[PDB]
Amino acid sequence: SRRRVVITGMGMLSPLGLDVPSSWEGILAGRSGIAPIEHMDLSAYSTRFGGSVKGFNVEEYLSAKEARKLDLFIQYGLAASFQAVRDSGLEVTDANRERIGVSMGSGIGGLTNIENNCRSLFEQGPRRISPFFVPGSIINMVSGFLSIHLGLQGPNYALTTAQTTGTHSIGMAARNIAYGEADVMVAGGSEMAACGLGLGGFGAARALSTRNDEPTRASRPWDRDRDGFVLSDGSGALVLEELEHARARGARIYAELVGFGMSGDAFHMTAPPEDGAGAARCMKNALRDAGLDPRQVDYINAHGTSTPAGDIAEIAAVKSVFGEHAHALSMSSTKSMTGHLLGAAGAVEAIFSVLALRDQVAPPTINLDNPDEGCDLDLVAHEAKPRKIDVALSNSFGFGGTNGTLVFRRFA
Amino acid sequence: SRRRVVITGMGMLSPLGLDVPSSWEGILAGRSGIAPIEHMDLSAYSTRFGGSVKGFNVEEYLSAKEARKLDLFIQYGLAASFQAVRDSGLEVTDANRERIGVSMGSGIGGLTNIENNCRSLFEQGPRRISPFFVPGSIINMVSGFLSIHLGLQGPNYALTTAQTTGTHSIGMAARNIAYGEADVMVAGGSEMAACGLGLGGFGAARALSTRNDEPTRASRPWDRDRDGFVLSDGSGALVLEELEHARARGARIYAELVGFGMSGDAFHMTAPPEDGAGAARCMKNALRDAGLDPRQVDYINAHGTSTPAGDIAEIAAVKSVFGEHAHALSMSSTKSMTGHLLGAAGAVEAIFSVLALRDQVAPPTINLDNPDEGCDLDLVAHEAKPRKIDVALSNSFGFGGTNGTLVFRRFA
Ligand SMILES: CCc1csc(-c2cnc[nH]2)n1
């Protein structure tokens, strides 16, 4: 029968920090992680900035010899996973290793490595493709390499659901534990799509902000002057654990994961429906899963991508789900500061939602100077808002009309 | 408790055929689908052959315009999915659309598209990258496009577990139905990695057979002269359905899906452990899940990739799990004919396992001329074997030590 699931460990690389506390400090201070990209020449690109991980040292985690075989998205996913496992205090043993698994996903995976090997193939020939090209690039190898390093013999998989990946990964991992397929899961996502194909491909779709002369103001969810998402890099990982397992070992519990929803829009390959119907169906599924009155929801970490259609669809969905209570909760987009970590967005935002519960504060939506028509909820404009939060919801939406919602609450 | 899950629809593209019955006819005749790769200069490559899908007409499924937006692996996944939904007879309605979902995966995703957009980026710059590059290349777009086309509003996601993808996709879709999150799921996988990057990437790891002179003899699982796997393309999709739902509409039921196992080896990034410990745990997990004794297993569709370490690991795992029953079951590798469809392998091999139950026949392992040291099981060498089959297993083992096992049972 269905078991309860708690969060005992969290790990992160973001444009605001090389771990959770440093990232969260930036979040509560309203700091932007967005800046012109230094790692490549983007003069021919319509977008030349994004949220880079600054000063990442893979030799805090892995030997340089191993690191050279792995795409940055794998290095970032392992860094966050190692932080989360360490933060949990969990000891992996012969007695429990079969009951500990991993589900770390990515939206695009090892695009930098595929681009670099494509350059080798086209300029030199196939004999110059790396022997490590496949295992160092494919999405499942965060889960794979983490399992090999820590000896995790539980369910081992990866999701890829575009901008919903981190949320789906965490929800499905919670279901694994709920249904008894595992007692512990490391789950989240990682992304590093800031290569020519990434910036060029999102640019060709005209999906990205082109505010090159003011990158920190580019990401402006629900602002009338928003012009698309800001592409960002990093990773979030959480240690999910069955409640009685966590209690038995005296784990520190950050919060309980009480609800998960999925729904497909079935609307459009890339565009959300303007009325937010799929996001509303997804939140309702999650609230019913959590056994909640919708009025219990205090804080929503929105998807909040800073796209014209996406941001207004989310307002419509929250009004439709929460009715008059939509005016009482606080909703913010931390993408205002981090940008959009794509497959990692739902993982870092789940962490921010848990910390909103720990610290009783709604992170701000920075840059919300002039809320757009109908964007008249409490969007926590400009500055963090201390408030009562018993229940927090984290939403993600993605290409293919794929929706996820996670519901977290305080654990006493 | 848990609901029962049955297979009511199947669909396929393979190197043997453009649907299930044509593919299955090839399988039972011992036909190879392996041939030198056409319309592609492989002069500089150490492998020049593989399993291509021959004569695929995407305009039976999509307009030319919608097809131009999608990588071949998405086209292939959609073709198998549309076939499987047609084969099931299911009528999607306003009353059931929120209960029908999709989980179609891929191991490597849109390499062909990435390669062609790389060509444009390197030659001409980013402004030649296609606007549909990102949504037309990402792995979750088979689930995305299928849900949009058919109006499916249930759980919408995509697995990517390398060579285990199709097995995990089907198993986790079965869990969605068993635990009441959906009544119907379309599940499986698709792959088209026959680009420079795929043949070059696997070639750089020396993982592929280089038997260019005799492509049809290259895939020879458990044969002492095997020299690695054969890269193949295509897709498999199954309609999974809750039993009472299938019975209420008078569905034709092929078989019941009674068990699903997952395990991680935690051993090596590409190589399985010689003793098959991971595969043994995963099969035992799947049999425990099904409430079946190893003695009840009649037929195993092996992973059987034709790699030195993989094939011998599977013999060891089967001897370990089945003890005095290990010789009584029949175990075959259909990859002897199809080659290795990577993330689609588990999907087309779940279908072949279901048809083994329908037709009471074990498909052959062709090319098994000289079984290797210790390969003395009933590997169905050379010719199909009519026999009693009540319980059939399908195994997949992939990069990162990721394992999956499905258990199917006759339904009457
Ligand atoms: C942690 C496992 C690992 C990292 S890089 C690697 C490897 C490289 N060549 C064989 N194996 N294994």
Ligand SMILES: CCc1csc(-c2cnc[nH]2)n1
């Ligand atoms: C406790 C969180 C944390 C910060 S840095 C870190 C780590 C784990 N392994 C190397 N570094 N864990």
